[PDB]
Amino acid sequence: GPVPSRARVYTDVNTHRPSEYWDYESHVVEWGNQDDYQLVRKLGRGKYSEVFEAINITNNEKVVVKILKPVKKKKIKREIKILENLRGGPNIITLADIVKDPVSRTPALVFEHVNNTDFKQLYQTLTDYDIRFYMYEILKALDYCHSMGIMHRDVKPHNVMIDHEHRKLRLIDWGLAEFYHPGQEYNVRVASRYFKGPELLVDYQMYDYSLDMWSLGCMLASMIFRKEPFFHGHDNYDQLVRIAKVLGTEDLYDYIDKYNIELDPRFNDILGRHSRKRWERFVHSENQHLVSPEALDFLDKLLRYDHQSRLTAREAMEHPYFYTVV
Numbered sequence: 001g002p003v004p005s006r007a008r009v010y011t012d013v014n015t016h017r018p019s020e021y022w023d024y025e026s027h028v029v030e031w032g033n034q035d036d037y038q039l040v041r042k043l044g045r046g047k048y049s050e051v052f053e054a055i056n057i058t059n060n061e062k063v064v065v066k067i068l069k070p071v072k073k074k075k076i077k078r079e080i081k082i083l084e085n086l087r088g089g090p091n092i093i094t095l096a097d098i099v100k101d102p103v104s105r106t107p108a109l110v111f112e113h114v115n116n117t118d119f120k121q122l123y124q125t126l127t128d129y130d131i132r133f134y135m136y137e138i139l140k141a142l143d144y145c146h147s148m149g150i151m152h153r154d155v156k157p158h159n160v161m162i163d164h165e166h167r168k169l170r171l172i173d174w175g176l177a178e179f180y181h182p183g184q185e186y187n188v189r190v191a192s193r194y195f196k197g198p199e200l201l202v203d204y205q206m207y208d209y210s211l212d213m214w215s216l217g218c219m220l221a222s223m224i225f226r227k228e229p230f231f232h233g234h235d236n237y238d239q240l241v242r243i244a245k246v247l248g249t250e251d252l253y254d255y256i257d258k259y260n261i262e263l264d265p266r267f268n269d270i271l272g273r274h275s276r277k278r279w280e281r282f283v284h285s286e287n288q289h290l291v292s293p294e295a296l297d298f299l300d301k302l303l304r305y306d307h308q309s310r311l312t313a314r315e316a317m318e319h320p321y322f323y324t325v326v
């Protein structure tokens with residue numbers, strides 16, 4: 001079968017901690033008062049959640065209320081435990097309260113409010129410096145959650161809130177996050193299609209924190225090249241073909257050979273043969289002010305088939321691309 005793998009960093013953080021820490025199924029949840037909060041407006045709608053702007057009527061402070069469709073109790077417990085574990089970490093959304101609606105029997109998570117600036121409006125006003133600054137802020141959040149034995153598994157622009165006026169960034173939506181246990185085989189049906197790492201697409205279940213580093217690389221490539229998304233798959237099989245059109249099919253076979261992965265027969269007639277492209281090929285007149293040899297070098301070290309060969313969040317923070325930031 002497939003060759004086993006483990007993370008290169010923070011490998012045994014959960015193994016050396018008591019059960020209390022990672023055993024979310026045994027975690028005791030305590031509700032606050034739903035009447036402390038008045039809902040203002042709908043902010044968004046997710047697969048299993050509805051997000052609202054609200055007012056905490058006891059202190060007149062704005063909050064964010066994430067109402068969960070209680071589809072799977074185990075998943076709600078997991079997110080609550082993870083949020084509690086990460087509470088106060090750099091650039092991590094702060095869980096402030098957990099409440100329930102007794103009439104509809106519905107749980108809700110209460111967060112610190114984040115004054116998010118528009119993604120489609122930011123995309124053109126941002127400078128080379130701004131990209132470096134916010135990428136470093138996301139890395140602070142990932143290095144922290146990885147050090148806490150947690151993989152986010154859903155890194156994408158929609159899960160990154162930015163209050164540009166105050167240069168404040170928060171990594172949100174911890175509903176797909178999971179505790180990392182070396183040797184564990186995880187469900188590959190995580191992340192959003194465009195941000196899925198090759199390990200997910202070839203159904204390699206023994207993945208780790210490095211998955212988040214692929215997803216971050218997809219975000220960086222889309223920002224510096226002004227191409228959203230960078231890898232535009234139309235389905236999960238086509239997604240690997242879009243990556244192969246950039247990274248080449250040679251390094252893809254080296255990857256699957258290294259881990260003795262069995263490629264699904266659905267890849268037989270669509271994968272084709274593709275040469276390894278130079279990152280310089282994606283530079284155009286519309287994006288050249290955001291591209292530099294340091295950015296390309298950094299990107300090349302993130303977007304690698306081999307999850308083990310990708311930079312960790314800490315190594316990424318030490319890259320020359322971030323020499324200009326504090």
Ligand SMILES: OCCCNCc1ccc(-c2ccccc2)c(Cl)c1
Nearest residue numbers: 119131134135157158160161219223
């Ligand atoms: O409304 C949903 C939240 C959408 N957030 C907008 C947003 C704006 C900029 C970035 C970004 C990405 C790479 C480098 C620098 C900045 C991200 Cl990840 C997200």
